[PDB]
Amino acid sequence: MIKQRTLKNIIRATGVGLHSGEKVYLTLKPAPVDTGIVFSRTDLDPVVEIPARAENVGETTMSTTLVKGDVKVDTVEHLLSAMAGLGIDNAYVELSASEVPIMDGSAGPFVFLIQSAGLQEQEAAKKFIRIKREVSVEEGDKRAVFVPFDGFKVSFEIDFDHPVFRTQQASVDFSSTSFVKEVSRARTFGFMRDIEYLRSQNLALGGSVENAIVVDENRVLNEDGLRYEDEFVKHKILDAIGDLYLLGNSLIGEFRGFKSGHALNNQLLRTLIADKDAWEVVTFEDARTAPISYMRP
Ligand SMILES: O=C(NC[C@H]1C[C@@H](NC(=O)[C@@H]2C[C@H](F)CN2)CN1C(=O)C1CC1)c1ccc(C#Cc2ccc(CN3CCOCC3)cc2)cc1Cl
Ligand SMILES: [Zn+2]
Numbered sequence: 001m002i003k004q005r006t007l008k009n010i011i012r013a014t015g016v017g018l019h020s021g022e023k024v025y026l027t028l029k030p031a032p033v034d035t036g037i038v039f040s041r042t043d044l045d046p047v048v049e050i051p052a053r054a055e056n057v058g059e060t061t062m063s064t065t066l067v068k069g070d071v072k073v074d075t076v077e078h079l080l081s082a083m084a085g086l087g088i089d090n091a092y093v094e095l096s097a098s099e100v101p102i103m104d105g106s107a108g109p110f111v112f113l114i115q116s117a118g119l120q121e122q123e124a125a126k127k128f129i130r131i132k133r134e135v136s137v138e139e140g141d142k143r144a145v146f147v148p149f150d151g152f153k154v155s156f157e158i159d160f161d162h163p164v165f166r167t168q169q170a171s172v173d174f175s176s177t178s179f180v181k182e183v184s185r186a187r188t189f190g191f192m193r194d195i196e197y198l199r200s201q202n203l204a205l206g207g208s209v210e211n212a213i214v215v216d217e218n219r220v221l222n223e224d225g226l227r228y229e230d231e232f233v234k235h236k237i238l239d240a241i242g243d244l245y246l247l248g249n250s251l252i253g254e255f256r257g258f259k260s261g262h263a264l265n266n267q268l269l270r271t272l273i274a275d276k277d278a279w280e281v282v283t284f285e286d287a288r289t290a291p292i293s294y295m296r297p
Helices: 076-084 108-116 192-200 230-246 262-274
Strands: 004-005 013-014 022-031 037-042 048-053 066-068 069-074 091-095 120-126 129-133 133-138 143-146 153-157 169-173 190-191 213-215 250-258 277-280
Touching: 013 108, 022 108, 037 069, 048 066, 048 069, 048 129, 076 108, 076 230, 108 120, 108 277, 133 262, 143 262, 153 230, 169 230, 192 213, 230 250, 230 262
Parallel strands: 037 091, 129 250, 153 250, 190 213
Antiparallel strands: 004 120, 013 022, 022 091, 037 048, 066 069, 129 277, 133 143, 143 250, 153 169
16 A cells, blocks of 8 residues: 655755745654645744645746745745655654755755655645646646646656757656656756846845756857756756645646646636546555555665
8 A cells, every 4th residue: 555655764955946046944843644745934923834735825026936925935935845756745844944955956965965864654645636637727828737647747848939949848757757766856047137136126046056947048158068858848847846836745647738837727726626526536556556656665
């Protein structure tokens, strides 16, 4: 039977917030059965805890933000991506500040920290949301879709009118392709012109080539270049996997993005939750006959 997983050991990590430019201390802790992923602002008295759930998403412009009163946690989607890919159900994310550290721009540092610590099976069935019906949202030229699928799969397409865009489409069946190998190293990215402006408005204060792909009109300015021919669309998939995890249960089904982002990914989540005709919660008495598979712990 497919069981809930938490961390075996606690993980301590250090970084900077992409927007805040603030140094932040990160502690990942095991958690009991049926906790979910809970973000916890330990710099406050009293300490403030926001479950990583679609109900707790704030104004979706720069990144995925969790909110509870006037306390926020900025840029959760990369860490949540990492935890999704390794199948982590239960964990406490402690932060000494408002923003999750950016690390290298990818999920890879987070995935390493998690597997280093190790994972622990817990005595309870894992709960899965299975897409039963197509559910689709559009706004202008953007679109984001759930389609039933005996497994877990994400496709994405982007279209920037810009010399640097290379492959702008990709699809990954995560039951036959490794999240760790193929998606987790995909780095966030930013246009020279936007970054010059946004910096001027006290935004992206922690950005650098050390944590972002920087791009002028013509080329990646990063000296050692890209990790993947298709890094940009691969990062969109990585962000999508994070936002999907705000459902609070692992997904059996497929996600398709067309120029989508946090805002419309969040509309799709809300529209899916709202239409109980479109999904069901299932468990599995036998892994050998389940449509998705997990690594050994
Ligand atoms: O938000 C950013 N990019 C959004 C990109 C990535 C995708 N979103 C994601 O990945 C989501 C959203 C979040 F990004 C995380 N997850 C979607 N997307 C788009 O579609 C873009 C709109 C086209 C971003 C990235 C890097 C910097 C930056 C920076 C930077 C880099 C270098 C320097 C140069 N300095 C030189 C001196 O040393 C310090 C650095 C300064 C700032 C600033 C920003 Cl504002
Ligand atoms: Zn991202």
